[PDB]
Tab-separated table of C-alpha atoms and ligand atoms in Angstrom:
chain	number	residue	atom	x	y	z
A	1	UNK	CA	-52.176	10.832	44.215
A	2	UNK	CA	-50.646	10.739	40.653
A	3	UNK	CA	-46.836	11.065	41.205
A	4	UNK	CA	-45.345	14.365	39.955
A	5	UNK	CA	-48.646	16.215	39.547
A	6	UNK	CA	-49.430	19.491	41.331
A	7	UNK	CA	-51.625	17.723	43.915
A	8	UNK	CA	-48.937	15.112	44.582
A	9	UNK	CA	-46.333	17.862	45.085
A	10	UNK	CA	-48.720	19.564	47.467
A	11	UNK	CA	-48.391	16.688	49.941
A	12	UNK	CA	-44.522	17.048	50.058
A	13	UNK	CA	-42.774	19.139	52.738
A	14	UNK	CA	-39.241	17.728	52.642
A	15	UNK	CA	-37.869	14.260	53.290
A	16	UNK	CA	-39.944	11.392	54.750
A	17	UNK	CA	-38.597	8.557	56.885
A	18	UNK	CA	-39.635	5.284	58.508
A	19	UNK	CA	-38.079	2.865	60.946
A	20	UNK	CA	-36.070	-0.022	59.576
A	21	UNK	CA	-35.090	-1.372	63.003
A	22	UNK	CA	-34.009	-0.346	66.515
A	23	UNK	CA	-30.937	1.524	65.139
A	24	UNK	CA	-31.887	2.847	61.633
A	25	UNK	CA	-34.516	4.704	59.632
A	26	UNK	CA	-35.003	4.699	55.907
A	27	UNK	CA	-35.213	8.265	54.435
A	28	UNK	CA	-36.413	9.397	51.038
A	29	UNK	CA	-35.732	12.794	49.477
A	30	UNK	CA	-37.520	14.515	46.586
A	31	UNK	CA	-36.506	17.434	44.397
A	32	UNK	CA	-38.854	18.992	41.779
A	33	UNK	CA	-37.125	20.055	38.536
A	34	UNK	CA	-38.154	23.671	37.827
A	35	UNK	CA	-37.681	22.767	34.116
A	36	UNK	CA	-40.171	19.859	34.011
A	37	UNK	CA	-39.524	16.363	32.614
A	38	UNK	CA	-36.625	14.678	30.757
A	39	UNK	CA	-37.359	16.318	27.347
A	40	UNK	CA	-37.496	19.875	28.662
A	41	UNK	CA	-34.698	19.597	31.222
A	42	UNK	CA	-30.911	20.135	30.977
A	43	UNK	CA	-30.394	18.581	34.453
A	44	UNK	CA	-28.345	15.336	34.247
A	45	UNK	CA	-27.642	14.584	37.909
A	46	UNK	CA	-28.904	15.667	41.293
A	47	UNK	CA	-26.582	14.883	44.255
A	48	UNK	CA	-27.791	14.751	47.874
A	49	UNK	CA	-24.988	15.898	50.122
A	50	UNK	CA	-25.454	15.088	53.840
A	51	UNK	CA	-23.011	16.730	56.275
A	52	UNK	CA	-20.841	14.181	58.092
A	53	UNK	CA	-22.436	11.300	56.179
A	54	UNK	CA	-21.908	11.636	52.429
A	55	UNK	CA	-18.123	12.099	53.063
A	56	UNK	CA	-17.729	8.986	55.278
A	57	UNK	CA	-15.278	5.470	50.683
A	58	UNK	CA	-17.792	4.081	48.106
A	59	UNK	CA	-19.242	5.537	44.862
A	60	UNK	CA	-21.864	8.296	45.342
A	61	UNK	CA	-25.326	7.657	43.903
A	62	UNK	CA	-27.365	10.401	42.239
A	63	UNK	CA	-31.091	11.074	42.699
A	64	UNK	CA	-32.945	9.315	39.909
A	65	UNK	CA	-35.673	10.971	37.801
A	66	UNK	CA	-39.036	9.154	37.771
A	67	UNK	CA	-39.517	8.705	33.959
A	68	UNK	CA	-41.956	11.224	32.454
A	69	UNK	CA	-42.081	13.436	35.547
A	70	UNK	CA	-40.323	16.391	37.119
A	71	UNK	CA	-39.590	14.213	40.230
A	72	UNK	CA	-36.058	13.277	41.336
A	73	UNK	CA	-35.954	10.816	44.173
A	74	UNK	CA	-33.298	9.259	46.386
A	75	UNK	CA	-33.541	6.954	49.438
A	76	UNK	CA	-30.852	6.210	52.049
A	77	UNK	CA	-30.536	5.048	55.698
A	78	UNK	CA	-29.780	7.131	58.768
A	79	UNK	CA	-29.198	6.372	62.456
A	80	UNK	CA	-32.220	6.932	64.732
A	81	UNK	CA	-30.228	9.347	66.922
A	82	UNK	CA	-28.898	11.461	64.055
A	83	UNK	CA	-29.414	15.121	63.158
A	84	UNK	CA	-27.661	17.162	60.527
A	85	UNK	CA	-27.938	19.338	57.507
A	86	UNK	CA	-28.096	18.373	53.794
A	87	UNK	CA	-28.328	20.073	50.421
A	88	UNK	CA	-29.153	19.146	46.829
A	89	UNK	CA	-26.840	19.617	43.868
A	90	UNK	CA	-28.661	19.705	40.505
A	91	UNK	CA	-26.013	19.840	37.847
A	92	UNK	CA	-25.681	19.669	34.076
A	93	UNK	CA	-22.436	17.680	34.454
A	94	UNK	CA	-22.075	14.017	34.129
A	95	UNK	CA	-18.284	13.728	34.527
A	96	UNK	CA	-18.084	13.733	38.340
A	97	UNK	CA	-18.125	10.338	40.156
A	98	UNK	CA	-17.960	8.101	37.094
A	99	UNK	CA	-15.106	5.833	38.310
A	100	UNK	CA	-15.754	2.784	40.558
A	101	UNK	CA	-13.046	5.880	44.147
A	102	UNK	CA	-9.993	7.193	46.050
A	103	UNK	CA	-10.707	9.337	49.121
A	104	UNK	CA	-9.135	12.301	47.290
A	105	UNK	CA	-11.132	11.598	44.077
A	106	UNK	CA	-14.217	11.948	46.347
A	107	UNK	CA	-13.233	15.223	47.984
A	108	UNK	CA	-12.283	16.718	44.599
A	109	UNK	CA	-15.624	15.555	43.237
A	110	UNK	CA	-17.613	17.347	45.936
A	111	UNK	CA	-15.377	20.389	45.762
A	112	UNK	CA	-16.358	20.723	42.070
A	113	UNK	CA	-20.052	20.216	42.831
A	114	UNK	CA	-20.662	22.057	46.100
A	115	UNK	CA	-20.720	25.562	44.462
A	116	UNK	CA	-24.097	24.510	42.899
A	117	UNK	CA	-25.575	23.302	46.240
A	118	UNK	CA	-29.066	24.476	47.167
A	119	UNK	CA	-31.389	23.985	50.106
A	120	UNK	CA	-34.372	21.663	49.730
A	121	UNK	CA	-37.038	24.158	48.533
A	122	UNK	CA	-39.789	22.120	50.192
A	123	UNK	CA	-38.120	21.984	53.588
A	124	UNK	CA	-39.228	25.012	55.747
A	125	UNK	CA	-36.082	24.475	57.934
A	126	UNK	CA	-33.441	25.856	55.623
A	127	UNK	CA	-30.784	28.511	56.234
A	128	UNK	CA	-27.751	30.077	54.613
A	129	UNK	CA	-24.946	27.666	55.564
A	130	UNK	CA	-21.526	28.645	56.896
A	131	UNK	CA	-19.879	27.700	53.587
A	132	UNK	CA	-21.605	29.884	50.973
A	133	UNK	CA	-24.510	27.583	50.069
A	134	UNK	CA	-27.909	27.103	51.691
A	135	UNK	CA	-28.692	23.859	53.602
A	136	UNK	CA	-31.692	22.098	55.143
A	137	UNK	CA	-32.364	20.427	58.479
A	138	UNK	CA	-32.948	16.741	58.968
A	139	UNK	CA	-33.499	15.172	62.402
A	140	UNK	CA	-34.143	11.486	62.975
A	141	UNK	CA	-36.788	10.770	65.738
A	142	UNK	CA	-34.414	9.823	68.546
A	143	UNK	CA	-32.151	12.821	68.138
A	144	UNK	CA	-31.989	14.530	71.609
A	145	UNK	CA	-33.958	17.662	72.465
A	146	UNK	CA	-32.148	20.962	71.789
A	147	UNK	CA	-33.078	23.332	74.626
A	148	UNK	CA	-35.330	26.161	73.441
A	149	UNK	CA	-35.253	25.475	69.695
A	150	UNK	CA	-38.754	23.868	69.608
A	151	UNK	CA	-40.450	26.773	71.376
A	152	UNK	CA	-38.907	30.088	70.214
A	153	UNK	CA	-40.502	33.309	71.560
A	154	UNK	CA	-40.470	36.907	70.219
A	155	UNK	CA	-37.671	38.904	71.894
A	156	UNK	CA	-38.911	41.456	74.361
A	157	UNK	CA	-36.143	43.940	73.409
A	158	UNK	CA	-34.667	43.344	69.933
A	159	UNK	CA	-30.847	43.156	69.626
A	160	UNK	CA	-28.891	46.302	68.794
A	161	UNK	CA	-26.433	46.103	65.914
A	162	UNK	CA	-23.454	48.487	66.155
A	163	UNK	CA	-20.325	48.856	64.057
A	164	UNK	CA	-17.096	48.221	65.954
A	165	UNK	CA	-14.267	50.142	64.376
A	166	UNK	CA	-11.119	48.678	65.878
A	167	UNK	CA	-8.087	50.855	66.356
A	168	UNK	CA	-5.877	47.824	67.155
A	169	UNK	CA	-7.202	45.684	64.291
A	170	UNK	CA	-7.609	48.491	61.755
A	171	UNK	CA	-10.910	47.090	60.574
A	172	UNK	CA	-14.670	47.429	61.110
A	173	UNK	CA	-17.237	44.769	61.848
A	174	UNK	CA	-20.821	44.313	63.035
A	175	UNK	CA	-21.480	43.579	66.703
A	176	UNK	CA	-24.883	42.589	67.993
A	177	UNK	CA	-25.806	43.385	71.572
A	178	UNK	CA	-28.801	41.554	73.056
A	179	UNK	CA	-30.120	41.599	76.616
A	180	UNK	CA	-32.613	39.178	78.161
A	181	UNK	CA	-34.809	38.949	81.211
A	182	UNK	CA	-35.798	41.723	83.535
A	183	UNK	CA	-34.437	45.202	82.625
A	184	UNK	CA	-33.541	46.026	86.261
A	185	UNK	CA	-31.356	42.891	86.515
A	186	UNK	CA	-28.011	43.773	88.072
A	187	UNK	CA	-24.743	41.864	87.635
A	188	UNK	CA	-26.037	40.169	84.451
A	189	UNK	CA	-23.432	37.742	83.128
A	190	UNK	CA	-21.836	38.566	79.756
A	191	UNK	CA	-21.587	35.935	76.976
A	192	UNK	CA	-19.397	36.592	73.964
A	193	UNK	CA	-20.290	34.644	70.812
A	194	UNK	CA	-17.854	34.173	67.951
A	195	UNK	CA	-19.189	33.790	64.350
A	196	UNK	CA	-21.757	36.325	65.549
A	197	UNK	CA	-23.104	37.002	62.117
A	198	UNK	CA	-24.218	33.407	61.773
A	199	UNK	CA	-26.004	33.318	65.176
A	200	UNK	CA	-27.465	36.761	64.565
A	201	UNK	CA	-28.657	36.407	60.967
A	202	UNK	CA	-28.484	32.855	59.686
A	203	UNK	CA	-29.897	31.057	62.643
A	204	UNK	CA	-30.908	33.906	65.008
A	205	UNK	CA	-30.481	32.904	68.657
A	206	UNK	CA	-32.664	35.743	69.975
A	207	UNK	CA	-36.003	33.902	70.167
A	208	UNK	CA	-34.356	30.792	71.707
A	209	UNK	CA	-32.489	32.655	74.424
A	210	UNK	CA	-35.712	34.571	75.053
A	211	UNK	CA	-37.551	31.279	75.511
A	212	UNK	CA	-35.015	29.726	77.859
A	213	UNK	CA	-34.666	32.892	79.972
A	214	UNK	CA	-38.472	33.143	80.304
A	215	UNK	CA	-38.455	29.705	81.849
A	216	UNK	CA	-35.387	30.444	83.991
A	217	UNK	CA	-33.068	27.984	82.272
A	218	UNK	CA	-30.806	30.972	81.676
A	219	UNK	CA	-30.269	34.008	83.923
A	220	UNK	CA	-30.943	37.492	82.502
A	221	UNK	CA	-27.826	38.302	80.491
A	222	UNK	CA	-25.966	40.429	77.924
A	223	UNK	CA	-24.950	38.599	74.756
A	224	UNK	CA	-22.310	40.068	72.461
A	225	UNK	CA	-22.139	38.536	69.007
A	226	UNK	CA	-19.023	39.399	67.015
A	227	UNK	CA	-19.003	39.328	63.159
A	228	UNK	CA	-16.041	37.275	61.819
A	229	UNK	CA	-16.152	39.499	58.635
A	230	UNK	CA	-15.093	36.814	56.071
A	231	UNK	CA	-13.126	33.600	55.687
A	232	UNK	CA	-9.664	35.281	55.620
A	233	UNK	CA	-10.240	37.578	58.575
A	234	UNK	CA	-11.717	34.717	60.490
A	235	UNK	CA	-8.718	32.363	59.771
A	236	UNK	CA	-6.320	35.110	60.932
A	237	UNK	CA	-8.280	36.435	63.944
A	238	UNK	CA	-9.735	33.375	65.618
A	239	UNK	CA	-6.933	30.810	65.952
A	240	UNK	CA	-4.685	32.023	68.858
A	241	UNK	CA	-4.475	35.700	67.969
A	242	UNK	CA	-3.646	37.839	71.005
A	243	UNK	CA	-4.394	41.114	69.178
A	244	UNK	CA	-8.009	40.013	68.499
A	245	UNK	CA	-8.691	39.380	72.218
A	246	UNK	CA	-6.833	42.511	73.412
A	247	UNK	CA	-9.012	44.521	71.065
A	248	UNK	CA	-12.146	42.753	72.245
A	249	UNK	CA	-11.190	43.447	75.920
A	250	UNK	CA	-9.829	47.016	75.634
A	251	UNK	CA	-12.179	48.468	72.986
A	252	UNK	CA	-15.339	46.383	72.488
A	253	UNK	CA	-16.352	45.267	76.007
A	254	UNK	CA	-15.952	48.687	77.630
A	255	UNK	CA	-18.286	50.074	74.892
A	256	UNK	CA	-20.769	47.251	75.492
A	257	UNK	CA	-20.736	47.903	79.231
A	258	UNK	CA	-22.027	51.540	78.800
A	259	UNK	CA	-24.817	50.412	76.457
A	260	UNK	CA	-25.722	47.183	78.334
A	261	UNK	CA	-24.110	46.898	81.786
A	262	UNK	CA	-22.833	43.430	82.845
A	263	UNK	CA	-20.873	41.753	85.673
A	264	UNK	CA	-17.086	42.030	85.926
A	265	UNK	CA	-16.924	38.592	87.509
A	266	UNK	CA	-14.826	36.280	85.350
A	267	UNK	CA	-16.637	33.271	86.887
A	268	UNK	CA	-19.867	34.095	85.046
A	269	UNK	CA	-18.295	35.555	81.858
A	270	UNK	CA	-18.732	33.218	78.912
A	271	UNK	CA	-16.793	32.999	75.674
A	272	UNK	CA	-18.434	30.532	73.189
A	273	UNK	CA	-17.365	29.376	69.742
A	274	UNK	CA	-17.427	26.552	67.218
A	275	UNK	CA	-14.356	25.224	65.316
A	276	UNK	CA	-11.878	28.136	65.032
A	277	UNK	CA	-14.223	29.941	67.395
A	278	UNK	CA	-14.015	27.073	69.955
A	279	UNK	CA	-10.271	27.112	69.776
A	280	UNK	CA	-10.366	30.934	70.087
A	281	UNK	CA	-12.704	30.716	73.086
A	282	UNK	CA	-10.346	28.392	74.933
A	283	UNK	CA	-7.295	30.451	73.967
A	284	UNK	CA	-9.105	33.453	75.607
A	285	UNK	CA	-9.822	31.742	78.950
A	286	UNK	CA	-6.200	30.394	79.108
A	287	UNK	CA	-4.610	33.843	78.713
A	288	UNK	CA	-7.268	36.165	80.260
A	289	UNK	CA	-8.991	34.081	83.073
A	290	UNK	CA	-9.358	37.424	84.947
A	291	UNK	CA	-11.873	38.388	82.256
A	292	UNK	CA	-13.183	35.040	80.758
A	293	UNK	CA	-13.724	32.306	83.396
A	294	UNK	CA	-16.214	30.165	81.389
A	295	UNK	CA	-15.416	28.592	77.986
A	296	UNK	CA	-17.890	26.971	75.612
A	297	UNK	CA	-15.960	25.154	72.874
A	298	UNK	CA	-17.871	23.076	70.276
A	299	UNK	CA	-15.920	21.010	67.671
A	300	UNK	CA	-12.879	23.154	68.488
A	301	UNK	CA	-10.138	23.077	65.886
A	302	UNK	CA	-7.457	21.891	68.316
A	303	UNK	CA	-5.235	20.581	65.470
A	304	UNK	CA	-4.415	24.235	64.480
A	305	UNK	CA	-2.217	25.047	62.501
A	306	UNK	CA	-1.403	21.518	61.296
A	307	UNK	CA	-4.119	20.395	58.829
A	308	UNK	CA	-0.159	14.136	62.320
A	309	UNK	CA	1.342	16.663	64.749
A	310	UNK	CA	-0.149	18.157	67.972
A	311	UNK	CA	-1.831	21.604	67.675
A	312	UNK	CA	0.062	24.528	69.223
A	313	UNK	CA	-2.443	25.075	72.050
A	314	UNK	CA	-2.080	21.492	73.247
A	315	UNK	CA	1.731	21.803	72.983
A	316	UNK	CA	1.746	25.031	75.026
A	317	UNK	CA	-0.547	23.426	77.615
A	318	UNK	CA	1.753	20.376	77.845
A	319	UNK	CA	4.777	22.635	78.446
A	320	UNK	CA	3.079	24.553	81.264
A	321	UNK	CA	3.404	27.763	79.214
A	322	UNK	CA	-0.316	28.251	79.920
A	323	UNK	CA	-2.629	26.901	82.612
A	324	UNK	CA	-6.368	26.071	82.474
A	325	UNK	CA	-6.709	27.190	86.113
A	326	UNK	CA	-9.708	29.280	87.204
A	327	UNK	CA	-11.804	27.811	84.370
A	328	UNK	CA	-15.133	26.114	83.745
A	329	UNK	CA	-15.252	24.561	80.301
A	330	UNK	CA	-17.875	22.935	78.103
A	331	UNK	CA	-15.932	20.776	75.686
A	332	UNK	CA	-17.974	19.203	72.940
A	333	UNK	CA	-17.234	17.356	69.644
A	334	UNK	CA	-19.188	15.166	67.178
A	335	UNK	CA	-18.532	11.458	66.440
A	336	UNK	CA	-19.242	12.056	62.754
A	337	UNK	CA	-16.171	14.376	62.656
A	338	UNK	CA	-13.397	11.875	63.650
A	339	UNK	CA	-10.374	14.100	63.256
A	340	UNK	CA	-12.007	16.865	65.388
A	341	UNK	CA	-12.966	14.185	67.956
A	342	UNK	CA	-9.324	12.987	68.300
A	343	UNK	CA	-7.977	16.516	68.804
A	344	UNK	CA	-10.615	17.186	71.461
A	345	UNK	CA	-9.809	13.912	73.313
A	346	UNK	CA	-6.100	14.774	73.267
A	347	UNK	CA	-6.930	18.167	74.840
A	348	UNK	CA	-9.271	16.592	77.386
A	349	UNK	CA	-6.493	14.116	78.373
A	350	UNK	CA	-4.173	17.084	78.895
A	351	UNK	CA	-6.752	18.995	80.985
A	352	UNK	CA	-6.810	16.152	83.523
A	353	UNK	CA	-5.582	18.320	86.531
A	354	UNK	CA	-8.728	20.437	85.940
A	355	UNK	CA	-10.967	17.482	84.920
A	356	UNK	CA	-13.911	18.037	87.284
A	357	UNK	CA	-14.487	21.631	86.066
A	358	UNK	CA	-15.164	20.231	82.591
A	359	UNK	CA	-18.476	19.270	80.961
A	360	UNK	CA	-17.269	16.748	78.427
A	361	UNK	CA	-19.721	15.903	75.669
A	362	UNK	CA	-19.833	13.694	72.549
A	363	UNK	CA	-22.664	14.003	69.949
A	364	UNK	CA	-24.283	12.047	67.060
A	365	UNK	CA	-23.579	14.735	64.520
A	366	UNK	CA	-20.901	16.335	62.554
A	367	UNK	CA	-19.244	19.609	61.957
A	368	UNK	CA	-22.638	21.159	61.603
A	369	UNK	CA	-24.428	24.234	62.993
A	370	UNK	CA	-27.719	22.287	63.201
A	371	UNK	CA	-26.046	20.177	65.888
A	372	UNK	CA	-24.124	23.066	67.463
A	373	UNK	CA	-27.242	25.120	68.076
A	374	UNK	CA	-28.349	22.668	70.761
A	375	UNK	CA	-24.959	22.329	72.463
A	376	UNK	CA	-24.613	26.101	72.512
A	377	UNK	CA	-27.839	26.456	74.559
A	378	UNK	CA	-27.070	23.453	76.766
A	379	UNK	CA	-23.498	24.719	77.317
A	380	UNK	CA	-24.706	28.154	78.437
A	381	UNK	CA	-27.125	26.335	80.793
A	382	UNK	CA	-24.259	24.278	82.332
A	383	UNK	CA	-21.868	27.164	82.674
A	384	UNK	CA	-24.384	29.430	84.358
A	385	UNK	CA	-25.969	26.726	86.578
A	386	UNK	CA	-24.089	27.893	89.739
A	387	UNK	CA	-26.051	31.225	89.479
A	388	UNK	CA	-29.144	29.083	90.346
B	1	NA	NA1	-42.702	23.729	68.324
């Protein structure tokens, strides 16, 4: 009842929202200063950073402290269909975002601040982000269902983590092997997931796949999740790197097959990734359609390597150096990530001769795992649907 008191804080479990109109909701966020009120606290600003929203040309506004309390509060508006992740940035600095600002001023600003990002401690839905700070989930009421995520179930057989020591790549990484449905299942499709460490540890997919397979949305299957190791490895290995996929095919999969047998049918073999991983996943089906006949690409980085020039994959597809023949593809991108959107549309245009084998999807979200988690499940559902 009295704002900022223990009992008041008790009633707070993350942001609260209410409809403004048909299109928008108003949303309020609270952060509690561990250090107490103005007198006792060194905190000068708290920034709310919302993925795909905070980035998109006016001056950022801080949370404001309610005078005399440990409460910081900030209100904004969000689209009814929107879902995405956010973080708080409590900082002792007062120099960032003072000017009334250039697009590059903004980016620089957030670059300086993002190292101090934290998840909302009162939001139960928080995870270690992909960018070395924790984040929290926010979903507006009309955001679409994400298959399986609302009714996770304990895995029947927990995933096995092995170390894959690659002779070709001269490195070691974690691989997680997870099998679903009935043990005796024969000719189980294989799905390979890039950024495996994220989907194995940060936002574990196990209980969601379990849930969907139990209700026969997904066939019994073998999932192989590959650790990207770190940012540098990832940026070398994922974007169009033949040696990565030759190692995967010649060393990793034959190991996985003796531990967890799966089908050698390309037409049910899935390769799934996001950004560099989506690009990688397509690159794999274009060059080894005998092994990978199904591609799940979400927010694929089709601009690669050019951070106003076509990406190399698109160029090689234009030139007929590679064909998308013998492929089923889920191709997904968010509207709140405009440059990714454009690259994906350019690819889609190019894939015209193979247009009807493509599940083309747009989304009200950004470059954000909270959005991807749904499209990942739905994409696996679409690709495997002919097995039903
Ligand atoms: Na639930």
